[PDB]
Design a protein around this ligand. Structure first.
Ligand SMILES: CC(=O)O[C@H]1C(=O)[C@@]2(C)[C@H]([C@H](OC(=O)c3ccccc3)[C@]3(O)C[C@H](OC(=O)[C@H](O)[C@@H](NC(=O)c4ccccc4)c4ccccc4)C(C)=C1C3(C)C)[C@]1(OC(C)=O)CO[C@@H]1C[C@@H]2O
Ligand SMILES: CC(=O)O[C@H]1C(=O)[C@@]2(C)[C@H]([C@H](OC(=O)c3ccccc3)[C@]3(O)C[C@H](OC(=O)[C@H](O)[C@@H](NC(=O)c4ccccc4)c4ccccc4)C(C)=C1C3(C)C)[C@]1(OC(C)=O)CO[C@@H]1C[C@@H]2O
Ligand SMILES: Nc1nc2c(ncn2[C@@H]2O[C@H](COP(=O)(O)OP(=O)(O)OP(=O)(O)O)[C@@H](O)[C@H]2O)c(=O)[nH]1
Ligand SMILES: Nc1nc2c(ncn2[C@@H]2O[C@H](COP(=O)(O)OP(=O)(O)OP(=O)(O)O)[C@@H](O)[C@H]2O)c(=O)[nH]1
Ligand SMILES: Nc1nc2c(ncn2[C@@H]2O[C@H](COP(=O)(O)OP(=O)(O)O)[C@@H](O)[C@H]2O)c(=O)[nH]1
Ligand SMILES: Nc1nc2c(ncn2[C@@H]2O[C@H](COP(=O)(O)OP(=O)(O)O)[C@@H](O)[C@H]2O)c(=O)[nH]1
Ligand SMILES: [Mg+2]
Ligand SMILES: [Mg+2]
Lengths: 426, 430, 426, 430
């Protein structure tokens, strides 16, 4: 029943996916050993969406862990929930990609794509009614951006009709940790736009901005950014794992949220968000959730929505609430801020409400937005690419892998085409 | 997995090896006898036998026995495989000629034999860490003969080059530029990333920072060992951002011939000085770009940075790294080439630096390894080329090189090659 | 329901506003932690006027604390009721204004006006039916006089219809603590007259005169002057927070109290006032309250009303009293002292009575007066300005901030214009 | 937040620093070792490390080592960062010439280097507190070289000037006016507010008030430290009316060139004398305007007051301040310029004065810091200008200044500048 098959690519992808697995195992009440320990039967009916039923009433997640290094596999298996995973889905090479997209897409990951495909196919045939694939990866470096796009293309080729949603942490200028990120991002979005039905753009800088300027953490580590990602990870698929008054699965979002086929790079967000010493004082009412939700500080990318127009926004609320105030805020936001939403398309909001709130939360709101302002990251990536493209650096480490100049040129042309379409409707 | 074969050529190479392995046995907790009192963190550098013994994968090659059979008498005589440390019969006479054609010819075949018997147990061999000196006869000639055959027998494997480079003023031999110039073909053609070491600059480092008036070369060694261990830190221990040895050199290298980065280490500080400073990530980040901390006597402010690699280790948070590099890009005195507005590669490791009990370096919770290529380093060759002219203009000492089987024109190809390298490092700065 | 949004500017403003918050928290029975502890439900219906309802039945005041230094924020948060305030409304810089009006109005406060506006706007949208803004600040120095006028102008620009009442402690010759006060006062009243619908002039010297010659305090500290200010602070808004027979909110006062639009700098006062050893002997009857109320000693500015004519006077009484004696005193005062009230406008008094007296008081009277004698402080400020204007001192510390001579000239011209209008009807 | 970098130049500067930090460690409760036994009240003056150590942000610069390496031997040898206290090789020879061109040239670059490494941790740097002497060779020449570069590298930051000024009668060197006159360009152009210190006036202060017949300069220092701490009192502790360092100097300064106020401190009183007086706010207010309490041998009754700043500290009520200043404006003997009928700036702080255990000053619950500019102080320069003529009329000692690289006409520009300053302080008095 609407089974969803997860794939992890790169160290970023597999660690954030592992923490997502931890979060939704707590939501479904799954013991670290894999046994069920939840309180209500509501955690139990839609276990088949993320986990496989096995002997002993223990449940194994439908995740395929893909990497080119064994060290990340070693860390994840030794992590808090390493034991719950399938030993077979730990499919990995030995030599790393070295943050080389060409390595992952032609040499290093091409040999392991056969060993990942035979696992993803068995996972899919284990499903009763497959709905799609949620894939976690990073546009930075050559592992997540490199092999991730290749296997995404393969699964899209053999699964043409299933939903393809990807959550992509993507490079940024001021919190860049690797020199050669823009090549990787340009060569990755080239395949992401053509193949993926859904892509969530996540930028690390805005995660940092959330954890300082909203969460007031003095030392928010990398796991806290993983947590911020996993919150929306769990939120976007809430409707098809739990009952709610307005059920909106992934394709419910899709039919409402992407006006033209290529305009599918979106803006995630989550509410509520407070510091430790300020949650005691906050009124968690839904209107306040809304005023927090469309704030430019709550978002997870540097693209400020005030520099563009929203095409479609998705607000999947959660908890035991009525909904007239839901409609009134969703119309007030787009009425008083009608200059920030495309007036030519009147009702830019898709509303979904779930009946069971997250554990420890009385209510929650998950933000998904289509704004023309998201081109801020794309054109900046293209500009940084040009600053390292126009007269030939670092290309020997790609062309040595069989990579060629004209494909780089087409990738840049496609970035320019994308930013053109997203500026067209602004 | 992740093995690296270390080569040690010449007196400088073998003794810097003696200091490096002294550091490695302490940081990985191996006794001088090779035993482990009580993770596979040692598999990168040491091999294991059935009896619980750690055997290093290293070769000490010297055309003369004195230093190596001194090692056969020292505390590490039993740590090393005795016939993987190879000794010749005739010294190199500070002459590239005999070391490259005459005396190293009969011994190199055994050296590659031992290299093969070190390669065949390495399941995940990552690269080579060869140590020598430019000015020395062995470190020039035998290395020149050895990288030639290594580049055809291990062409795919990376070959990192850690070499000791003459000072603008301090020198120990008159023939040193002769040996240095015929080495330039090896680094350009048969090396993947060369690290140059200047004795006078690091003399100034230990004079100013360590407050020690009278250190030896052993103090130089007990910091070259730290720089090499910090470069190899990500391969042996866990880190939030572990940088692969191939990832490292891909981040350094803009072009196949531009692979000559400078190195600096922070915090180089004495034990009496470590107490009064908090020693934040920012100041060790700021101290690295200070020309008074460079390992080679060249002013980075005279040149332009191409690639920057932040190899942090210890209790360092990557947010503090980003905050530091924002300040680094803020000042104009540090102007990077128009190639790299992204600027910085960041590498963080969880292991704090390991202190030598007899060393002069303080115990610090944080340590950073700075490796950067820049156009200012051409000045370190811009005095060596004018230097070489100042001897070759009469054919100053060539009759020995001629008398030992070198073609006279090999000097002509040598200074042509250094001129080509000097030009290559100038056009990229525009 | 007639929500009123408070803003604190300068150390004077935020400390006197904090003590006002303490006073009216006691009146409304609000615990220091923010919980309700009042006795009757009468304290509870109009909590929305000053406080926001939150989770746990605790109440947060609608105050925005603005300063250019963190030290005053540190003192107020560590004060008796620091914990009840919003951590978000502590909006503050680091470098102080140095008692420079130009700094606050152009450089130091201009960067923080964006961070104060996003807070005042959220506070206003949190209101059900906004009535106005009560702003506390000081005409002395460059923080309260400097940024206060700028943000007052901004809120007036974006809220053109709401009531604008400000309580302004203003410089004085004999109890002057700063050299450069007159510049600040002249540059502040320039905006106060043009923008504010209401301004209460408070002079420190008359507060001292009250605490010695009426209250008989040997050591009345600065907090006692803050208390004297806060008494009228609470009195002026009594009618729209509690029932009374004659309800007179802020705009009720306004329509009765300012005959021409620019004649809106007024004279506050409060009764009863006794020493500790004399309250035991006093008869607190309303006629005695009146005889105390129009005394020149009860007022809070050096402007003696016998040197001018009252345009309009507001007497907002409070307590369980009948009102025929109220009318008889309010007519006797203006009949036997008809030479002190403009005969050309016959009934100069606005009468308001509240049913619940202040805690510990059986009755109370709050004095608001429009006298032409208030020009005493304005013309004296102009004269002191001229003594430091006519031949150029201290101007390098303003002109260095982008300030210009001709604007000083227009400010002085506007002070002269004001004193001209207020002498015109005397 | 609110950091200030203190500069100490010359013997007078370094020793007045030794006394000031002696006062600061006591008032903020730091041991001479830098530790805190058991608020961020120390962040204004001291930096903190991870180990719980307070490191002052101060530089001791002397062209000769004797006083500073004496500090390296004293009880505060471990309190200070050893290489932020800079020593030269050749003394200044009471000569502005070598200190400004010859000997300070090689050392100033390190001084600004240390100033930069003190600035980069100051997040809220407020200003500079530089200490020196006019008559000294170092305090003249090196300060003249240093404010020049500080005014272009830290132009926005305020630079308070606390300088020791020669007496009308007491003098230690014949060349003192020569050094003093070439300092005048620095205070006029590269200083924001200068505080002048006369040794003979404060000699009279300690003779009359402290009842001590035989004090040293250390007694002078243990009151200059109080005056500077009282000026910095509002930045470090809480007060009802805290005066910012920028607020302070905005209240002092009527014109950019009129920034030379006098200083007095009250109550300067011995321990035997503190008992018999109640020591009200009024009398410490009245004692400050008494010419027998001025720090510079000039009669304020001979001149006119422009700006008045009441820096009270301790158990003082501002009402008593207003009552005192009403009496102050009541008497006619204290006539203020027609600029300031408002007269007085009031600053109150809650911290009582901190007593030095070895000092000669009494413990008083109240203390007031008096800083005022007046036209009477031009007499302190009105004898120095006639003095300088009395030497320059033969070219008395210029061959040394000429011999060390000074232009002969720099004396001409010097007395032209002092004449311009003297005129500037006379027209404003009308
Ligand atoms: C005592 C109390 O009320 O504290 C709450 C809480 O509401 C706060 C402090 C929580 C708390 O979260 C954090 O501290 C945090 C830190 C870094 C990154 C993200 C969160 C909380 O940890 C998080 C936790 O939330 C959940 O349990 C949700 O189900 C959440 N799951 C997790 O956060 C989680 C934590 C550990 C392991 C596995 C899951 C979730 C959210 C969306 C979708 C699915 C699940 C709750 C209610 C609290 C604490 C415990 C303090 C917040 O978290 C969430 C996700 O709601 C941070 O801001 C929100 C709201 C609150 O301020
Ligand atoms: C035993 C007794 O009868 O003493 C009374 C009292 O009537 C006297 C002494 C009080 C008293 O006030 C003072 O001592 C005082 C000191 C400095 C400045 C102002 C007041 C009293 O403290 C004040 C207090 O008044 C109130 O509680 C009012 O509600 C007042 N609120 C406060 O004063 C207050 C005090 C502490 C904390 C919070 C509020 C108020 C007035 C107008 C509008 C709103 C609130 C009362 C009745 C008394 C005491 C306790 C002695 C007086 O106060 C007021 C404001 O009515 C001073 O003159 C009046 C009348 C009386 O003489
Ligand atoms: N930094 C550093 N340099 C060294 C050390 N030992 C030798 N050198 C360098 O080696 C150079 C001279 O080479 P040699 O001393 O002859 O050593 P070699 O490489 O074995 O050459 P041969 O003796 O001819 O075989 C000197 O200029 C030094 O710079 C050392 O311990 N530290
Ligand atoms: N009030 C006071 N003045 C001092 C003190 N020490 C030195 N001076 C002044 O310094 C002047 C002479 O300067 P120097 O003693 O030479 O000190 P210097 O500034 O280092 O000058 P050089 O020795 O030439 O480098 C004297 O006239 C004193 O007035 C002191 O402890 N207290
Ligand atoms: N938000 C987030 N970003 C990360 C995390 N870990 C690493 N990153 C950054 O994301 C980028 C992704 O590159 P990376 O995954 O290392 O490349 P790959 O090895 O080829 O997959 C890196 O440059 C990191 O700086 C994480 O846990 N969260
Ligand atoms: N009535 C009263 N006056 C005060 C109080 N505190 C300070 N003042 C005086 O009011 C004037 C206001 O100036 P100030 O607020 O310091 O200037 P700012 O810092 O730029 O806001 C000062 O000169 C003080 O003398 C107080 O609590 N009550
Ligand atoms: Mg040798
Ligand atoms: Mg000296």
């Amino acid at each position: 029943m609407r089974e969803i098959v997860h794939i992890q690519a790169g160290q970023c992808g597999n660690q954030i996916g592992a923490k997502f697995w931890e979060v939704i195992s707590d939501e479904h009440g799954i013991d670290p050993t894999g046994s069920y320990h939840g309180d209500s039967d509501l955690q139990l009916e839609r276990i088949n969406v993320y986990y496989n039923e096995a002997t002993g009433n223990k449940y194994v997640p439908r995740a395929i862990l893909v990497d080119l290094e064994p060290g990340t596999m070693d860390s994840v298996r030794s992590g808090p929930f390493g034991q719950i995973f399938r030993p077979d889905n730990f499919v990995f090479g030995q030599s790393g990609a070295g943050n080389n997209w060409a390595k992952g897409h032609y040499t290093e990951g091409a040999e392991l794509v056969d060993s990942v495909l035979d696992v993803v196919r068995k996972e899919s045939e284990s499903c009763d009614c497959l709905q799609g694939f949620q894939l976690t990866h990073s546009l930075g470096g050559g592992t997540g951006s490199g092999m991730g796009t290749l296997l995404i293309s393969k699964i899209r080729e053999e699964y043409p009709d299933r939903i393809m949603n990807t959550f992509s942490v993507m490079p940024s200028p001021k919190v860049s940790d690797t020199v050669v990120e823009p090549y990787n991002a340009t060569l990755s979005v080239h395949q992401l736009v053509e193949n993926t039905d859904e892509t969530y753009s996540i930028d690390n800088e805005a995660l940092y901005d959330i954890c300082f300027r909203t969460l007031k953490l003095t030392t928010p580590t990398y796991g806290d950014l993983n947590h911020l990602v996993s919150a929306t990870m769990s939120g976007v698929t809430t409707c098809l794992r739990f009952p709610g008054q307005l059920n909106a699965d992934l394709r419910k979002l899709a039919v409402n949220m992407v006006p033209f086929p290529r305009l599918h790079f979106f803006m995630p967000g989550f509410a509520p968000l407070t510091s430790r010493g300020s949650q005691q004082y906050r009124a968690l009412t839904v209107p306040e959730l809304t005023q927090q939700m469309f704030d430019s500080k709550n978002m997870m990318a540097a693209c400020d929505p005030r520099h563009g127009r929203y095409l479609t926004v998705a607000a999947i609320f959660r908890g035991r609430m009525s909904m007239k105030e839901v409609d009134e805020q969703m119309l007030n936001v787009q009425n008083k801020n009608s200059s920030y939403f495309v007036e030519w398309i009147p009702n830019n909001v898709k509303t979904a409400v779930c009946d069971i709130p997250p554990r420890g939360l009385k209510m929650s709101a998950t933000f998904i937005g289509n704004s023309t302002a998201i081109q801020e990251l794309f054109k900046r990536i293209s500009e940084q690419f040009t600053a390292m493209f126009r007269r030939k650096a670092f290309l020997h480490w790609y062309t040595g892998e069989g990579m060629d100049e004209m494909e780089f040129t087409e990738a840049e042309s496609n970035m320019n085409d994308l930013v053109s379409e997203y500026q067209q409707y602004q | 997995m992740r093995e690296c074969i270390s080569i040690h050529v010449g007196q400088a190479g073998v003794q810097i090896g003696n200091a490096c392995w002294e550091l490695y046995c302490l940081e990985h907790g191996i006794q001088p006898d090779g035993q482990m009192p009580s993770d596979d963190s040692f598999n990168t550098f040491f091999s294991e036998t059935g009896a619980g013994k750690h055997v290093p994968r290293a070769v000490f090659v010297d055309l003369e026995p004195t230093v190596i059979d001194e090692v056969r008498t020292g505390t590490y005589r039993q740590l090393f495989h005795p016939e993987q440390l190879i000794t010749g019969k005739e010294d190199a006479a500070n002459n590239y000629a005999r070391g490259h054609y005459t005396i190293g010819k009969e011994i190199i075949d055994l050296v590659l034999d031992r290299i093969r018997k070190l390669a065949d147990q390495c399941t995940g061999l990552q690269g080579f860490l060869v140590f020598h000196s430019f000015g020395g006869g062995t470190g020039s000639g035998f290395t020149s003969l050895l990288m030639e055959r290594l580049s055809v027998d291990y062409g795919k494997k990376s070959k990192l080059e850690f070499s000791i480079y003459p000072a603008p003023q301090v020198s120990t031999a008159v023939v040193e530029p002769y040996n240095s110039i015929l080495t330039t073909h090896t680094t350009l053609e048969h090396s993947d990333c060369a690290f140059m070491v200047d004795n006078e600059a690091i003399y100034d480092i230990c004079r100013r920072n360590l407050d020690i008036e009278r250190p030896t070369y052993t103090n130089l060694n007990r910091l070259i060992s730290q720089i090499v261990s910090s470069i190899t830190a990500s391969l042996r221990f866990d880190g939030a951002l572990n940088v692969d040895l191939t990832e490292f050199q891909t981040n350094l290298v803009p072009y196949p011939r531009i692979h000559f980065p400078l190195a600096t280490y922070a915090p180089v500080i004495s034990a009496e000085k470590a107490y009064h400073e908090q020693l934040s990530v920012a100041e060790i980040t700021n101290a690295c770009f200070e020309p008074a901390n460079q390992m080679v006597k060249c002013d980075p402010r005279h040149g332009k940075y191409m690639a920057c690699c932040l190899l942090y280790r210890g209790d360092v948070v990557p947010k503090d790294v980003n905050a530091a590099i924002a300040t680094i890009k803020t000042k104009r005195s540090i102007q990077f080439v128009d190639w790299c507005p992204t600027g910085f590669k960041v590498g963080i490791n969880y292991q704090p630096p390991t202190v030598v009990p007899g060393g002069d370096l303080a115990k610090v919770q944080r340590a950073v390894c700075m490796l950067s290529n820049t156009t200012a380093i051409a000045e370190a060759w811009a005095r060596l080329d004018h230097k070489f002219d100042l001897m070759y203009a009469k054919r100053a000492f060539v009759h020995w090189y001629v008398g030992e089987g070198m073609e006279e024109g090999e000097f002509s190809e040598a200074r042509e090659d250094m001129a080509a390298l000097e030009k290559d490092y100038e056009e990229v700065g525009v």
